[PDB]
Amino acid sequence: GAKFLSDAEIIQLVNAKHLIETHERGVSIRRQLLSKKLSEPSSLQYLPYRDYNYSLVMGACCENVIGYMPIPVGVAGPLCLDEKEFQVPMATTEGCLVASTNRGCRAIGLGGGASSRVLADGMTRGPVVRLPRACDSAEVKAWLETSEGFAVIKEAFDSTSRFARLQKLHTSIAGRNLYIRFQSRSGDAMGMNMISKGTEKALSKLHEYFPEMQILAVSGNYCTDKKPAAINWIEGRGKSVVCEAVIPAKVVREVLKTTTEAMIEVNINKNLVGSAMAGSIGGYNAHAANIVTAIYIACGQDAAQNVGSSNCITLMEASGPTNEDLYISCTMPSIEIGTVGGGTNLLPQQACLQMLGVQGACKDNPGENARQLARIVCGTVMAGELSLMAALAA
Amino acid sequence: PNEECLQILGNGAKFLSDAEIIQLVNAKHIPAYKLETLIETHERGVSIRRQLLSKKLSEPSSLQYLPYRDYNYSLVMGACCENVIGYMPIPVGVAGPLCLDEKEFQVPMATTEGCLVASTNRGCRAIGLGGGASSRVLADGMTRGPVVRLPRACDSAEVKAWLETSEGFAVIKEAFDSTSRFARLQKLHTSIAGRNLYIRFQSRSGDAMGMNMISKGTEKALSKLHEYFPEMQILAVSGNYCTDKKPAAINWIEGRGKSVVCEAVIPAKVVREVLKTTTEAMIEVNINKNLVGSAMAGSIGGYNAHAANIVTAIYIACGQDAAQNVGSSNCITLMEASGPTNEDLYISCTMPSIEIGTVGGGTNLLPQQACLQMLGVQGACKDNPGENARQLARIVCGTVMAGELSLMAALAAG
Amino acid sequence: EPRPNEECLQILGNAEKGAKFLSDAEIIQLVNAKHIPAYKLETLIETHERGVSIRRQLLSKKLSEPSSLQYLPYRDYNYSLVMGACCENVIGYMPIPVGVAGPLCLDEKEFQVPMATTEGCLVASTNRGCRAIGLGGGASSRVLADGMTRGPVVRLPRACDSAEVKAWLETSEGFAVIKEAFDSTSRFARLQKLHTSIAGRNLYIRFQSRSGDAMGMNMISKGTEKALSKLHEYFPEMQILAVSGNYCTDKKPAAINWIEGRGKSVVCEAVIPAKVVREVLKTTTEAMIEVNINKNLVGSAMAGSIGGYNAHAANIVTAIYIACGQDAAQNVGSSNCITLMEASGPTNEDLYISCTMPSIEIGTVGGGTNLLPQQACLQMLGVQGACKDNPGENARQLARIVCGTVMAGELSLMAALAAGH
Amino acid sequence: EPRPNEECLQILGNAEKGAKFLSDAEIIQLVNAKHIPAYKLETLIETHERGVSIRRQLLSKKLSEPSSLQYLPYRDYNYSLVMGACCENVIGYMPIPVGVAGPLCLDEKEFQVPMATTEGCLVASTNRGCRAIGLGGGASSRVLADGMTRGPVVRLPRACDSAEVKAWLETSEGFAVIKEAFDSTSRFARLQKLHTSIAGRNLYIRFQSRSGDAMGMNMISKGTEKALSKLHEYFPEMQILAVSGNYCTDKKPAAINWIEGRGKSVVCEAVIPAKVVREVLKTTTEAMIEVNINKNLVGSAMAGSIGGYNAHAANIVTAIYIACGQDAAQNVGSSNCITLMEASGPTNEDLYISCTMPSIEIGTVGGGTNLLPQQACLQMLGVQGACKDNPGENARQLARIVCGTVMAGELSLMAALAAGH
Numbered sequence A: 001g002a003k004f005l006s007d008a009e010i011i012q013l014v015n016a017k018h019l020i021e022t023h024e025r026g027v028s029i030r031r032q033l034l035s036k037k038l039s040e041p042s043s044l045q046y047l048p049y050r051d052y053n054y055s056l057v058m059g060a061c062c063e064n065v066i067g068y069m070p071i072p073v074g075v076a077g078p079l080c081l082d083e084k085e086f087q088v089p090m091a092t093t094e095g096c097l098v099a100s101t102n103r104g105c106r107a108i109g110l111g112g113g114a115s116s117r118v119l120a121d122g123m124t125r126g127p128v129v130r131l132p133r134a135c136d137s138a139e140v141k142a143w144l145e146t147s148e149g150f151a152v153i154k155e156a157f158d159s160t161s162r163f164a165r166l167q168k169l170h171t172s173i174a175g176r177n178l179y180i181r182f183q184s185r186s187g188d189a190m191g192m193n194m195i196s197k198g199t200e201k202a203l204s205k206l207h208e209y210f211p212e213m214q215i216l217a218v219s220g221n222y223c224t225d226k227k228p229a230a231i232n233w234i235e236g237r238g239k240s241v242v243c244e245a246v247i248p249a250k251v252v253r254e255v256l257k258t259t260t261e262a263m264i265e266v267n268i269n270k271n272l273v274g275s276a277m278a279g280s281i282g283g284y285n286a287h288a289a290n291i292v293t294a295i296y297i298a299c300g301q302d303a304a305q306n307v308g309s310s311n312c313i314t315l316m317e318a319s320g321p322t323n324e325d326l327y328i329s330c331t332m333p334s335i336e337i338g339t340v341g342g343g344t345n346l347l348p349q350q351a352c353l354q355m356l357g358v359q360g361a362c363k364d365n366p367g368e369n370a371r372q373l374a375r376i377v378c379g380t381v382m383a384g385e386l387s388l389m390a391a392l393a394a
Numbered sequence B: 001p002n003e004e005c006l007q008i009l010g011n012g013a014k015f016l017s018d019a020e021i022i023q024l025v026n027a028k029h030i031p032a033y034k035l036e037t038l039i040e041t042h043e044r045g046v047s048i049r050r051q052l053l054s055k056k057l058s059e060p061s062s063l064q065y066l067p068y069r070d071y072n073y074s075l076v077m078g079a080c081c082e083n084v085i086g087y088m089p090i091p092v093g094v095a096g097p098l099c100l101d102e103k104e105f106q107v108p109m110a111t112t113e114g115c116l117v118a119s120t121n122r123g124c125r126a127i128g129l130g131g132g133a134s135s136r137v138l139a140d141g142m143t144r145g146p147v148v149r150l151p152r153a154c155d156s157a158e159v160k161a162w163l164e165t166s167e168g169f170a171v172i173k174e175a176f177d178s179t180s181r182f183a184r185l186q187k188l189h190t191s192i193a194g195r196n197l198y199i200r201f202q203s204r205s206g207d208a209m210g211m212n213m214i215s216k217g218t219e220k221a222l223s224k225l226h227e228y229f230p231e232m233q234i235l236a237v238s239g240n241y242c243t244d245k246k247p248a249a250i251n252w253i254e255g256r257g258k259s260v261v262c263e264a265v266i267p268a269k270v271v272r273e274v275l276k277t278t279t280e281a282m283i284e285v286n287i288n289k290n291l292v293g294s295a296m297a298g299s300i301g302g303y304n305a306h307a308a309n310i311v312t313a314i315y316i317a318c319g320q321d322a323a324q325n326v327g328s329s330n331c332i333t334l335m336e337a338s339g340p341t342n343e344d345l346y347i348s349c350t351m352p353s354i355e356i357g358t359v360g361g362g363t364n365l366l367p368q369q370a371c372l373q374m375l376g377v378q379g380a381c382k383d384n385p386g387e388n389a390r391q392l393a394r395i396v397c398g399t400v401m402a403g404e405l406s407l408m409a410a411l412a413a414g
Numbered sequence C, D: 001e002p003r004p005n006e007e008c009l010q011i012l013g014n015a016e017k018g019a020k021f022l023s024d025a026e027i028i029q030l031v032n033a034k035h036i037p038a039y040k041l042e043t044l045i046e047t048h049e050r051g052v053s054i055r056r057q058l059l060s061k062k063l064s065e066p067s068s069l070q071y072l073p074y075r076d077y078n079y080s081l082v083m084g085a086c087c088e089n090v091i092g093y094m095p096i097p098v099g100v101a102g103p104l105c106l107d108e109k110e111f112q113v114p115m116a117t118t119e120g121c122l123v124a125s126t127n128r129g130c131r132a133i134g135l136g137g138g139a140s141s142r143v144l145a146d147g148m149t150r151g152p153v154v155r156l157p158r159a160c161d162s163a164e165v166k167a168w169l170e171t172s173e174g175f176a177v178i179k180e181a182f183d184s185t186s187r188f189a190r191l192q193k194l195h196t197s198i199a200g201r202n203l204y205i206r207f208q209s210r211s212g213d214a215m216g217m218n219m220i221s222k223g224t225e226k227a228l229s230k231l232h233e234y235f236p237e238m239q240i241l242a243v244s245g246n247y248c249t250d251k252k253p254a255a256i257n258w259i260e261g262r263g264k265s266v267v268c269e270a271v272i273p274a275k276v277v278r279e280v281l282k283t284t285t286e287a288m289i290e291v292n293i294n295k296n297l298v299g300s301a302m303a304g305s306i307g308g309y310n311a312h313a314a315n316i317v318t319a320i321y322i323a324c325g326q327d328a329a330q331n332v333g334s335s336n337c338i339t340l341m342e343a344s345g346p347t348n349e350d351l352y353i354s355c356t357m358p359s360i361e362i363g364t365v366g367g368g369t370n371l372l373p374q375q376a377c378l379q380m381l382g383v384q385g386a387c388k389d390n391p392g393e394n395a396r397q398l399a400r401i402v403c404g405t406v407m408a409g410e411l412s413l414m415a416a417l418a419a420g421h
């Protein structure tokens, strides 16, 4: 069919208002078509495209594909976390970020290592519905708060998928509007699509009970997905995680080139008081976003979710017998993460997840690989906080 | 043999095999950090780093499908990344044409989220058929927000008052401006918290994002302030008052980097046939999702559907700092009725803190330069310093608006 | 004339004489030179009003204008209910004019709403909003949630320990034990679902319960201390750092009150016919919507508001609160409100309006509601004191009335701004 | 003796007789038969107290309990300064007990701070904080900025035109034209640099200026209207949607007031020797710091607070505001405060404390400061009315007193939270 034609001929056919057998040649043709519309057609010459596996990308991850964008991947490690060691991949183009995180890791290792805990777990979706009157939306809120109402909604939600297991609902009214926050674990997937499908069936079951209910939007921004929101900071979203470590005074001096007292003075007055003066919600840290973003790009995550996933409060305190040691913790209530689906279906992304031992589904305990990866992120963020904060104090 | 191979390093490393260098590290003849300088070529430094790393992993074959060969590590080494074991391919798709200020743009988007490019492209089509979009840059200046301490809050009050006088601001401006060509200090903004004093330095930065530049100007500026006030302590050159890579109302209100607005009118027929919904439905969803819903969620600056998706994809493609998506995605999306019978859709996106550049950082790498070249904004603009960065900022905001149109249409049609 | 301090103290210590036998000057002499500090004047001097008079005379000597208190009234006020309950070092009272806005037509009833203010035009403006609602068929309201909160901060040795405590509180058995201890402290103390938040080794625990018709702070605080005492039995290394760790949150702006509610969460609504908007409010439905969106939503959003998506709910909350013996400082959270306005009816020319206020902190028993003047204003509304046959119904009704009066005030001021003066 | 309606009406319409020649019962007879509208009572009745009396009588017969107003007082109060200035449809006044905390040792002076509250122990607790400050060698304060704001929203045809108007206001020549129009309205008006914000075709414009010793709302609003009139001459397509588009921001929580200031921005501080912390506050510096960090910074942070990094600033702000004739609804923003506690001295055993309050909205002229009782409390502090020679000094001084009294309250409540019980 298309194999017996040439490159010039197939371009002539689509131009004339009128399929291809190999994925890489389809990319090549799309690149040549695009060149015709650019002022500099030679601009694509150093954008690569050759010998990348487009089979896993077409239809699943990307459209109108013209190549790929290489992001340098460095390793910060070993990170000593919950009695294990992790070599953490970090895809970035910011100078010194991987070296600085690496120093944070070294400080943590010498201090006995870090311990972390996952405090909560459940991706959310927050549709907006409308009723004729505020008295009607109030009725629906009351009904969703009975055990009988919650049970029928749970049955409908949980029918859509193996890992669909609905947790306590959260609701807010604004006149005749009602926002409904559905939360559920989702195996090792980040869970956006799963929870959305569950939410649609739950909302259709709710329609049966309340026929005058309009479903205005399956996402009414009450989730909240990929925008700053106090609701994510307070209620959590995805994995809520806490990590901690004590850095001996000697290590703060030799490795970090500062003191425990100076580190505490900067953290309080930068990460708490300064974030406070700037009007931050959830941004009580130095640069958690750098680490989250770098790990996310390396590990096939949705990097747009660094908006909520980077929420972090970094606290530093005096510790030990002489009160000269550095206690540090990071608390990240809304880490949106997964080891199956999305960009984690791609082979290079899986290489980075494999380094950490979290690639794919955990067959023995659904959701444990994603939980582990969240812990690693929170741990690596803490390393980053240590090093950069030390650089600022000194 | 161990000690024979050590003598060959002293003369060089090219005359030893991979295995002999690795054996030299494992037995402690040579420390692992000394491989950076000794090994000549960059790709063989990456290869030996990988092989050393692989034997430490629970799965030795983990890095099999992580590519590393035939990539330009020369630009990456000592500038963009360290402990490099390879690189991560992010698919690039193209959305366009985007009809913006009488130009057409083919917008590159680096993402792994399915249908994002296709959806954004459909937004672009509704905009093209509506007569195009128009944007303006409203403000420009990267910031840095150090925190200094004085012994008493009365002293910090003294310093703030001095910085607010015409005379004092002039002396600080001169020290700041001396560091760079583009460094031109705008009006200072300060907040006291007791004896803490937070000073927000703001300055244009040519076509660079400007973080490093404004930081150098800040250090020398605070050096001159130290002369007028010896008891002042420089606690941290960033005291989170910038604010960089964290959510902050100050960025939303004062702006950071490029503040931008974009707008378009989409005829009713284009809303029906291209977007598969009505103007009345789009407006009802925008109000109750992007305003009221974001309000009920306690959002500062997140009055949009999915601005972050587009900001992130363009940023990765175009060599930006993708972590700056935190502040750069700040956006309010507004929809209202338009035209004679209120049946046309007016849309605007306003994004007060797009942090962006076309020189420096990831924009120094060649694949990223290719994507910047597509848009006609690669490198520095010689005739008009800052114009390439301002143009990219306008493309981001316009592409965001096309994204909002498409996703909001899909939510309205349910 | 005043005799020496020694004789005066013997007359003071004598049971059959007391302070009644001493002069104002002699009382003032004993204070000036210790023996009596000043705060013991209340528990010594014959009458409350004389104690105030003495206090005013002492204060006046200290001031740079001795006649400063001349027009600060004090005589013939019922101080007996104020002493040891509502106020200390009392030198008098501050008259706040009270107007009446109504009838407020709400849930098929009519209310005459008292309002204590010094802002010109507030009561008349609110009365105009009431008239518009009344001619539109009236307002409807619903209490969506009810529970005063306290948000202590406790610390464990490590974050891992605080996580253990969070998880234990989340089990049915752990919560049951804590609920038992909380609920044992009072007949109204009925602990609802807990929300907790970790920050390192800190653990913030938000206790929520109804509290009859009382605002409930004192009662919830008592419940909380007993619950934390019980939690310490299971976790002996837990330090209670503060019974309030600002997680409640009380009298400070906080997203948590907006999102979770605090006290009473209420919604009110009404439809104003097109004609009524023109005749009473001197504007149009179309114009009110456009101002509401671009001021109360978009303007509030550009200013970086959490919970402040309204025009002047604070004006109404404060005036009703002062009038009705509420804690006026709680206007900070009680003012939280989103005001919404859209087109309604066959024509799509009628004005739908709603006010949602998630954190009205209110009560008809305790605190300032113990005083007779503020009880007269509660009596107007039919909500004074406890409702015996339905505990909490009076405070619920008062929250409904606040939300409804806020909506009246929203209608009127938004019409004024739309009509350009 | 009560006459028929028609006879009563001739007397009412007789210009040398009027309502004075009718009985209360006859005026009420006329009102119930719809001859006189109830709102017109104000200008028909001679004495204002009598107007209040008849309004109450009409009101009582509408209430579920007719005797509900018995203990709402009304007699012998000066309604002359209230009627058509501070309140409408007046049925009496509401006594709020006034207590006094002090001496507050602030900027080498001593203040006797008046506080109108119904919360038990607030005055005594604030008084204890004052004592700790006084024995610690005093507090020092500075007004860091000063200017009331108004934040109108205007609409242009397109976002491109709103952008044009913004750029025009930012030129030195365009600003000058606007500043001339603004400053022409009042001798105190001095327009500072303009802050602006776009949302599509909306433009929010934040006018800021001093206002003498007035709080300044009506003055700034007058100057805003004149300034936008001038702006309309250069951009006649501009539509002035609302003179307040919530960008001020007045009486709602808003990050803009926190970050930019509104009214007076003030900072206060003091060092409390360890000995005073022990004897007055019953605790240690170490314990107070740990509570302050984890409650007022971390707790407020976990609650998602903007500007509420304090314990009970609103308690003190509200009490002084009611006493001193301020607008108590402005406590919403005026309570914005960050309280910071730090170790000081050679063994880290003294307590550095500071409160920073960026948006104190305050005045000593106009509004409720026109009433005599409120003026008595202003006279107490030596700040009543206008400062002739140094305009603004009285309002500034009151703002410093509010910030310092807040710091006193923070000291005392935080010490009580730190010790326990």
Ligand SMILES: CC(C)c1c(C(=O)NCc2ccccc2)nc(-c2ccc(F)cc2)n1CC[C@@H](O)C[C@@H](O)CC(=O)O
Pocket: A094, A095, A096, A097, A099, A100, A103, A286, A287, A290, A387, A388, A391, B212, B215, B237, B238, B239, B240, B242, B243, B244, B245
């Ligand atoms: C690359 C890292 C992340 C870094 C470091 C750093 O970690 N230095 C120590 C080091 C370096 C190399 C090896 C070992 C140790 N210092 C800075 C820095 C700080 C202030 C300044 F003015 C300019 C540069 N940055 C960039 C921070 C930037 O990405 C977020 C920052 O703006 C967030 C904030 O703190 O506000």
Ligand SMILES: CC(C)c1c(C(=O)NCc2ccccc2)nc(-c2ccc(F)cc2)n1CC[C@@H](O)C[C@@H](O)CC(=O)O
Pocket: A193, A196, A197, A218, A219, A220, A221, A223, A224, A225, A226, B113, B114, B115, B116, B118, B119, B122, B305, B306, B309, B406, B407, B410
């Ligand atoms: C990939 C895009 C961005 C997209 C679309 C989309 O644009 N669809 C129309 C279309 C598709 C294909 C070709 C042409 C046009 N619909 C959804 C979606 C919404 C709700 C739902 F339940 C599940 C999927 N998403 C994901 C949104 C997601 O990444 C941010 C979203 O969560 C932000 C929000 O609205 O809160």
Ligand SMILES: CC(C)c1c(C(=O)NCc2ccccc2)nc(-c2ccc(F)cc2)n1CC[C@@H](O)C[C@@H](O)CC(=O)O
Pocket: C119, C120, C121, C122, C124, C125, C126, C128, C311, C312, C315, C412, C413, C416, D218, D221, D222, D243, D244, D245, D246, D248, D249, D250, D251
């Ligand atoms: C006293 C009331 C509350 C009021 C009215 C009002 O309701 N007028 C109509 C009316 C009057 C009398 C009888 C019947 C109807 N107009 C204003 C006003 C607006 C803008 C302006 F520049 C200056 C005065 N205010 C003060 C608003 C003030 O307390 C919160 C306001 O600042 C909150 C905001 O909108 O941002």
Ligand SMILES: CC(C)c1c(C(=O)NCc2ccccc2)nc(-c2ccc(F)cc2)n1CC[C@@H](O)C[C@@H](O)CC(=O)O
Pocket: C218, C221, C222, C243, C244, C246, C248, C249, C250, C251, D119, D120, D121, D122, D124, D125, D126, D128, D311, D312, D315, D412, D413, D416
């Ligand atoms: C009335 C004052 C302000 C006060 C005091 C107080 O100041 N005590 C020391 C004292 C007393 C008497 C004389 C001398 C010194 N303690 C409490 C209190 C704390 C925890 C508790 F569970 C219940 C009561 N409150 C009420 C605080 C309340 O109005 C805002 C508070 O809720 C704000 C907060 O901390 O979240």
